[model samples]
Target: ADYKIDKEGQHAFVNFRIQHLGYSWLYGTFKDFDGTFTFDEKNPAADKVNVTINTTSVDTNHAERDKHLRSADFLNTAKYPQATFTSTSVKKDGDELDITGDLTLNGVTKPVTLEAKLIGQGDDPWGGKRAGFEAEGKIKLKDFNIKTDLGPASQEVDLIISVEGVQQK
Candidate 1:
């Protein structure tokens, strides 16, 4: 079945964490993003996912740091205001789904794989059906054209995604 992300309810999130100068972890999230997914328990191979993230919506709890991230040093929101992800393949691996997709960011497109697991699925109190999943992936800053070097420990970023989708009629 195909499902629409419940953005109105703010149940979807695209989050990331990276090392800070090899000392601490810096976590952030993109506040504005939406997407849809097709899932069929009996046909895992046919599953699909598509998402669009607003680059300028990045938030890290620190105003100054967020401003720098929006500049050319990081996301470069001026040139690329949006990033996208479209699944190319999906395979059910044991209890998890191996989702491989093309992630387009910073004017570059690269294949990334996310390991996802279904959190829950059921009928909502409002007479709607919903399903949720949690996924994790990693990518190097240089791979996405983010050349601002923080340190050796900050070379890569880990993505943590959780989304709730409402079944579409």
Candidate 2:
């Protein structure tokens, strides 16, 4: 709560990729979300972060599909409204860190591990400090009781998180 995510110059996104018809991949992103993070510059493993994404912000470049995804058959944006991820532990590995956390979605909560890599860290043109991270993870639709059939959409989904935070002194 002490550290804050820079909303003014932030670049945070929650993106998804789903296998479609055993051929192409369907891509989408949650356009509206907010988060708070704290990074221990000296102890990278001690860093922590939490993000909340608006389910209705789902955009797949198709209005019909986006509306369907927000309906009860999918994310159920009316009831669930939002999805969240909170870090439980972090471990630095080379240029990346193993981030284990709980991801709550569609009224179901489960542990998820993400491979996060620090892409850049330095002082911004302004007085504030900045850091950029790219994280990747996966989730099974069955784990969250999401509707699934042997059809176009796969049983699992891949997640990509890009966060650029600004820290104030």
Candidate 3:
């Protein structure tokens, strides 16, 4: 069944983490994003994923840092206001789904793989069917034209996503 991401319910999250000076992880999230996905319990080959994230919605809990992250040094939100991910293929392994997709960010496109698993699927009290998933992936900062250089430890950013989708009627 096809599902529409439940952004209205705030059931979607696009979060990321990177090393902070090789000491701790700096966590952040894109507060605005939308996407849809196709899922079938019996047919993994038919699964698909598409998502668009607003780069300007970056929130790191720090006003100064978030502003810098949105500037030309990092996301360059002025030039590229959005980042997108479109799945090219889906491979099922046991209970997990390996999704390979072309991610366009910072005016650059690159292939990235996300590992996802179904967290839950059932009927909501509002009389709607729903499915939820949690996915994770990693990408190099330089691969997407983000060459601001945050040192060797912060060379890569890890994506952590969780979303709940309402089944399309």
Candidate 4:
């Protein structure tokens, strides 16, 4: 199936949650992101995806905290800049998909898998073709060498992504 990024309707919602030194979980979302994915149910092997996330768009409610996250302690927007993901393979299991891709963050590249679902596909009222999907995954910060410690913090970081796109002509 052909798929295109809606640009205006397209949005990538990213949720990040990590332990705050055993006190509680610190969670945040990146407000700005863009990506596109295309797949053929009849030919699952033909799936492809490309995503770009702006590290500086991080928003955790607190301004100072967001700035710190963009600093060297976490994302380090200056040195590493953007975090990106590009799918290398897509495998189908019934109605779900296992998308294996390379995720780059903080200048480190690692293989990651996203379990995705094709929520639906149809045409919009504005004469635009549309598709909807949601994916979920998790990764350990230590795996990418983001081993900064805030006393006794949790090493695992949870990520959730929601994607919507329009069919590109």
* lDDT against the true structure, each candidate: 0.96, 0.83, 0.95, 0.81
Where does candidate 1 have its weakest 10-residue lDDT segment?
Answer: 148-157
Off by over 4 Å in 1: none
Where model 4 places Cα greater than 4 Å from the true spot, the runs are 150-153
lDDT tens digits, residue span 1-64, model 3: 9999999999999999999989999999999999999999999999999999999999999999
lDDT of 1 by residue, 43-131 (tens): 99999999999999999999999999999999999999999999999999999999999999999999999999999999999999999
Q: Which candidate is the best by lDDT?
A: 1
Clashing residue pairs, backbone N/CA/C < 3 A, model 2: none
TM-score list, all predictions: 0.99, 0.91, 0.98, 0.90
Ranking by TM-score: 1, 3, 2, 4
Q: How close to the true structure is residue 85 of candidate 3, measured as C-alpha lDDT?
A: 97
Worst 10 residues of 2 by lDDT: 1-10
Clashing pairs in 1: none
lDDT of 4 by residue, 13-35 (tens): 77777778789988888777777
The lowest-lDDT stretch of 10 consecutive residues in candidate 4 is: 3-12
> Which structure is stronger by TM-score: 3 or 4?
3
Question: Could you tell me how far off, in angstroms, the CA of residue 104 lies in candidate 4 after the best superposition?
Answer: 0.8
What would you estimate as the lDDT of candidate 4?
0.81
Number of clashes in every candidate structure?
A: 0, 0, 0, 1
